[PDB]
Amino acid sequence: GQKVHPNGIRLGIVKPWNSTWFANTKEFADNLDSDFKVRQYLTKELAKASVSRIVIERPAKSIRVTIHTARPGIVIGKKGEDVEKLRKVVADIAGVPAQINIAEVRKPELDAKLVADSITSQLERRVMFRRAMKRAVQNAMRLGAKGIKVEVSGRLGGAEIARTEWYREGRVPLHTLRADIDYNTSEAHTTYGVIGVKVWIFKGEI
Amino acid sequence: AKQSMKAREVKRVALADKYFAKRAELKAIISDVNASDEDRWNAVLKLQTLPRDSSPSRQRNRCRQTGRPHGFLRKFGLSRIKVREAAMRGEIPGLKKASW
Amino acid sequence: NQYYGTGRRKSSAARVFIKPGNGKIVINQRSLEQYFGRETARMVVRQPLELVDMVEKLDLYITVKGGGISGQAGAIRHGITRALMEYDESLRSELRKAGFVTRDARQVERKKVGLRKARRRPQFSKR
Amino acid sequence: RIRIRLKAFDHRLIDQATAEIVETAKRTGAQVRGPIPLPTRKERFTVLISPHVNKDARDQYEIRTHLRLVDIVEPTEKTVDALMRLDLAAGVDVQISL
Amino acid sequence: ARIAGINIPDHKHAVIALTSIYGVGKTRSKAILAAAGIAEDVKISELSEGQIDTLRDEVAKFVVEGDLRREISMSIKRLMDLGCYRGLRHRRGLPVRGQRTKTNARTRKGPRK
Amino acid sequence: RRRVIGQRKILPDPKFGSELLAKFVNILMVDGKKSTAESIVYSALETLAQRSGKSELEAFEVALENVRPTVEVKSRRVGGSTYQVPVEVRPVRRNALAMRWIVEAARKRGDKSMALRLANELSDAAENKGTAVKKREDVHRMAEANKAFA
RNA sequence: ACUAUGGUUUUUAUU
RNA sequence: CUGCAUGGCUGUCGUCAGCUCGUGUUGUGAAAUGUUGGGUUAAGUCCCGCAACGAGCGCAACCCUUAUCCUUUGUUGCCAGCGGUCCGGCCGGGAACUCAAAGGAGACUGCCAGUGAUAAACUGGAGGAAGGUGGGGAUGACGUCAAGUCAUCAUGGCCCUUACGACCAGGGCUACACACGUGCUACAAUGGCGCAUACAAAGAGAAGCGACCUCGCGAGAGCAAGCGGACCUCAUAAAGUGCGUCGUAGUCCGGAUUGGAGUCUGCAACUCGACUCCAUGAAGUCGGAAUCGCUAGUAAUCGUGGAUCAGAAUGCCACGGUG
């Protein structure tokens, strides 16, 4: 059996957490639930915003979010009023006044979340996944990768077959902690299953 | 987990804003032992034996993402079967896999 | 002139002080002859003091806290040694040859998961 | 004269936060009282890897927590105003009560 | 043998010498002595020194043997034909405080072959 | 099959002048109870006080000269057959075997108390008869019924 | 190295 | 309902050394050569060699912890010097030291001697706090068992929906035609009990831990300090030692069974709860064919916490003592 998330396993390399907030243990379940309340709404509303990562931060009676997108022009607009709307509604579920920081992605087709979008959206469009995946792999090795694996799972092309398919390029370490692999997992669902995808990107050792 | 269960759990948070003012004091009044074979609540006892979700029993924290009845841990504020997802997503501050 | 030595064993710690000129043998304000009156480790504190002949030439003071009594004794042997090897640098090599100057490595192990009694494994005979 | 209670989940964070508080405190007080390190707090956990099966398999996790106090020895209150006009390292909690 | 009552032990501790004969409890077996100035130490085997020949009526003036049995059977005096829980569980040799009969039941019926 | 180790060297006691006291307190020792070991150590020399001889400083170590180990039996399997061989005791371990045989009756006999069991058995020391002697006497049978080994 | 010795384990699913 | 229809998620051999790609050679090919052999290793590890030359993944290391010296420093932990001063880390203070935190250094088979292929490496030696894998822990390649989960989530099919729903008053899941596994205590004298007393670690603690003090044979209840963390409380750790005492007695032991009387939670405890105090009391004197765990602070074996939670664990996890 396969085990442990290929990036979540590396948090032990003294990495920071996806939200930083302080509260005494008797209110910890609700202070954590407030964190899910914002992360689940922001990810649901950024599902088609070309976003690669989201980080939350919750200072004392405050919330400060940092989101990375390849296309900030579909998150900001109207002299900043179209994001002033997003600021209004996140404060409505956070219960605190908000700040919203939008970072712009360069080389987005080298980032595991946006490389995964490039195949997940085309798998929903019933595109020939072996071609679409081969291009996504070679394009990553063109743009800045040193090794990559993209791996598809279940109902391959709607057929009565499970297994996995990938075709790996370059080098991708498995158990070397200086390797810093960029990772993502997605689902395309359609009407006949879940139709999953996984991706591992290697850029060089730390 | 049942939709009629969370309905009761949500109404229990609004109960905390209407019951602990005076009805929790009426529950103390009808639980008193000091008087014997004399009436003082004869018409209002059925007006206090009806409320029941105000009992300390029959409560569990439950999972706020799966409604799971058991598996809670006060140190995490999270149901045990959802910790391994959160700890890989980085969603709990200070938590790390180490061994020692 | 006062001399000092640290000593450690099984998470316990000893602070030992030595002075020239005959006198006391103190441990937590008590006598070193009497604090280890029956203790199985009662010679462990003596081995380095015998090597100069005790209670005839120097003065000894000890403070110890926490853990076991055989622990505190084995910590004291290093604490005495660390002061005595500066009080007599002609003994510094004698204490290396006796091994009393090396750090105690007998640290306690911790309970394993799937096991109940430290590292005794729960038994299994058949399927 | 006041302590500035600084809390974090990381040592190099709580120190690089301290590094601008002691720099502010020199801009608003000429000198500082210097370090207070504290014993670092740590908790361990043994978590089940299976939802219902395999009772003898538990994985070993930590939560480590950091605290600092700074301690201000100038009674001039010029640092406790500037502390609330300061860009500080991210992921910490700061409190003051005279 | 059989000097303190119906039970056979030869040499027995004086503060429990009246146990296992149906008439005295563990604390009563020591209290019965101090009301008569009788020694609470050294094991006894014979009717010497007044140590137990002084205790014959002080035991018998209370519920003993079948009279003790009849008193601890007051629990079922309204259940001597009505079988409701305790009734049937006493009209036959049966448990009344729960029994995990699938183990630990030899003691209820007789020893294993 | 590849872990290689040795033996821990031990010093004679400053009072008793012998290396026996440095090891024998770890023999018959159980549950970490070394103060019970330091409380039964040669305690039979009081139940043997009329049969002790001169100098109680050596009056237990002299018994090893009558425990007199000569051979130890090893039993191993080669192919399907288990075999047994009596081999002569080794130059330091001969003393360890005497130290093991001297406590064979210390609990496993009806005399009651360790000291009385041990004094009775230290008085069967010359002939070695009846109970608690099997491991001392029946090992010798194999070395007198066969003197042609390889 | 060679104990003196023993017969027998329902069926089926990566297309 | 179907995880032998699935995504996701998690075991096991094993942390075993193994799984592959490019190129050159071989064979019709499957495939081999490589990756086998030799010396060596913890090891496809490190040396050597030969039609094989190199590379990728696993393996060593990077993650976690701890052991030492050197230097500077510190809270509510510490107390060598110094001021105050009954003398008290108490006040002032110090950061010497236990400890704590940071800064720096240290280990490399580097050095000696054999062995061996003048290699790698082992064993021994020297120096060192540490030595050959420093001690003790994450980490699971490519495979096997179609392992397990439709019982988290998601989902194709199948089924119930004038229901098997879930609202409410309530059952059963602690029912035994018979044995084993697990946990555990006694049969003890190398013991047990009472009384005294030596030496603790770790952790939890705002409808909590609850002190002093009071009441209640006691469980528990009341007055009520402090604490949200090195504050104040759970809480004087028990084995160990010392005196007394037992002395094969089916035992002061050990209490299945069991009756009463109190305590506590709850809308409600009898069944199938916990705690306490009385009175009543069987077995157990040694164990069949057989079986299990540890290589060192380990096996032994007694103490102390944590989670869950209205109320109740002997199961789960965690830390000391002797050894």
From Swiss-Prot, chain A:
Entry keyword set: Ribonucleoprotein, Ribosomal protein, RNA-binding, rRNA-binding
Family per record: Belongs to the universal ribosomal protein uS3 family.
Biological role: Binds the lower part of the 30S subunit head. Binds mRNA in the 70S ribosome, positioning it for translation. Plays a role in mRNA unwinding by the ribosome, possibly by forming part of a processivity clamp.
Subunit: Part of the 30S ribosomal subunit. Forms a tight complex with proteins uS10 and uS14. With proteins uS4 and uS5 encircles the mRNA as it enters the ribosome, which may play a role in mRNA helicase processivity. Some nascent polypeptide chains are able to cross-link to this protein in situ. In collided ribosomes contacts ribosome rescue factor SmrB.
The keyword Translocase appears for this protein: no
InterPro entries xrefs: KH_dom, KH_dom-like_a/b, KH_dom_type_2, KH_sf_prok-type, Ribosomal_S3_C_sf, Ribosomal_uS3_bac-typ, Ribosomal_uS3_C, Ribosomal_uS3_CS
Gene Ontology biological process terms in this record: cytoplasmic translation; ribosomal small subunit assembly
Gene3D superfamilies in the record: 3.30.300.20, Ribosomal protein S3, C-terminal domain
Recorded coiled-coil stretches: none
Domain KH type-2: residue ranges: 38-106
Protein name (record): Small ribosomal subunit protein uS3
GO cellular component, one term: cytoplasm
Pfam families named in the record: KH_2, Ribosomal_S3_C
Molecular function terms from GO: mRNA binding; rRNA binding; structural constituent of ribosome
Keyword Ribosomal protein annotated: yes
From Swiss-Prot, chain B:
GO molecular function: rRNA binding; structural constituent of ribosome; tRNA binding
Ribosomal protein recorded as keyword: yes
Keyword presence, Ribonucleoprotein: yes
Annotated GO CC locations: cytoplasm; cytosolic small ribosomal subunit; small ribosomal subunit
Domain of life: Bacteria
Pfam families named in the record: Ribosomal_S14
InterPro entries: Ribosomal_uS14, Ribosomal_uS14_bac/plastid, Ribosomal_uS14_CS
UniProt keyword list: Ribonucleoprotein, Ribosomal protein
SUPFAM superfamilies: Glucocorticoid receptor-like (DNA-binding domain)
GO terms for biological process, alphabetical: cytoplasmic translation; ribosomal small subunit assembly; translation
Similarity annotation: Belongs to the universal ribosomal protein uS14 family.
Complexes and interactors: Part of the 30S ribosomal subunit. Contacts proteins S3 and S10.
Function of the protein: Binds 16S rRNA, required for the assembly of 30S particles and may also be responsible for determining the conformation of the 16S rRNA at the A site.
Name of the featured protein: Small ribosomal subunit protein uS14
From Swiss-Prot, chain D:
Listed GO biological process terms: cytoplasmic translation; regulation of DNA-templated transcription elongation; ribosome biogenesis; transcription antitermination
Gene3D superfamilies the UniProt entry points to: Ribosomal protein S10 domain (3.30.70.600)
Domain of life from the UniProt record: Bacteria
CC annotations in GO: cytoplasm; cytosol; cytosolic small ribosomal subunit; small ribosomal subunit; transcription elongation factor complex
The entry's keywords: Ribonucleoprotein, Ribosomal protein, Ribosome biogenesis, RNA-binding, Transcription, Transcription antitermination, Transcription regulation
This protein's record includes keyword ATP-binding: no
Stored InterPro entries: Ribosomal_uS10, Ribosomal_uS10_CS, Ribosomal_uS10_dom, Ribosomal_uS10_dom_sf
UniProt cross-references to SMART domains, sorted A to Z: Ribosomal_S10 (SM01403)
Gene Ontology molecular function: any one: transcription antitermination factor activity, RNA binding
Keyword Kinase among UniProt keywords: no
PANTHER family: 30S RIBOSOMAL PROTEIN S10 FAMILY MEMBER (PTHR11700)
Family listed: Belongs to the universal ribosomal protein uS10 family.
Function comment: Involved in the binding of tRNA to the ribosomes. Part of the processive rRNA transcription and antitermination complex (rrnTAC). The complex forms an RNA-chaperone ring around the RNA exit tunnel of RNA polymerase (RNAP). It supports rapid transcription and antitermination of rRNA operons, cotranscriptional rRNA folding, and annealing of distal rRNA regions to allow correct ribosome biogenesis. In complex with NusB is involved in the regulation of ribosomal RNA (rRNA) biosynthesis by transcriptional antitermination.
Gene: rpsJ
Swiss-Prot record, chain F:
Keyword Membrane among record annotations: no
UniProt GO BP: cytoplasmic translation; negative regulation of translation; ribosomal small subunit assembly; translation
MF GO annotations: mRNA binding; rRNA binding; structural constituent of ribosome; tRNA binding
Keyword Nucleotidyltransferase assigned: no
GO CC entries: cytoplasm; cytosol; cytosolic small ribosomal subunit; membrane; ribosome
Role: One of the primary rRNA binding proteins, it binds directly to 16S rRNA where it nucleates assembly of the head domain of the 30S subunit. Is located at the subunit interface close to the decoding center, where it has been shown to contact mRNA. Has been shown to contact tRNA in both the P and E sites; it probably blocks exit of the E site tRNA. Protein S7 is also a translational repressor protein; it regulates the expression of the str operon members to different degrees by binding to its mRNA.
Subunit comment: Part of the 30S ribosomal subunit. Contacts proteins S9 and S11. Cross-links to IF3 and the P and E site tRNAs.
Family statement drawn from the similarity comment of this UniProt entry: Belongs to the universal ribosomal protein uS7 family.
Protein's name in the database: Small ribosomal subunit protein uS7
Organism: Escherichia coli (strain K12)
Phylogenetic placement of the source organism: Bacteria, Pseudomonadati, Pseudomonadota, Gammaproteobacteria, Enterobacterales
Full-length numbering of the shown residues: 3 to 152 of 179
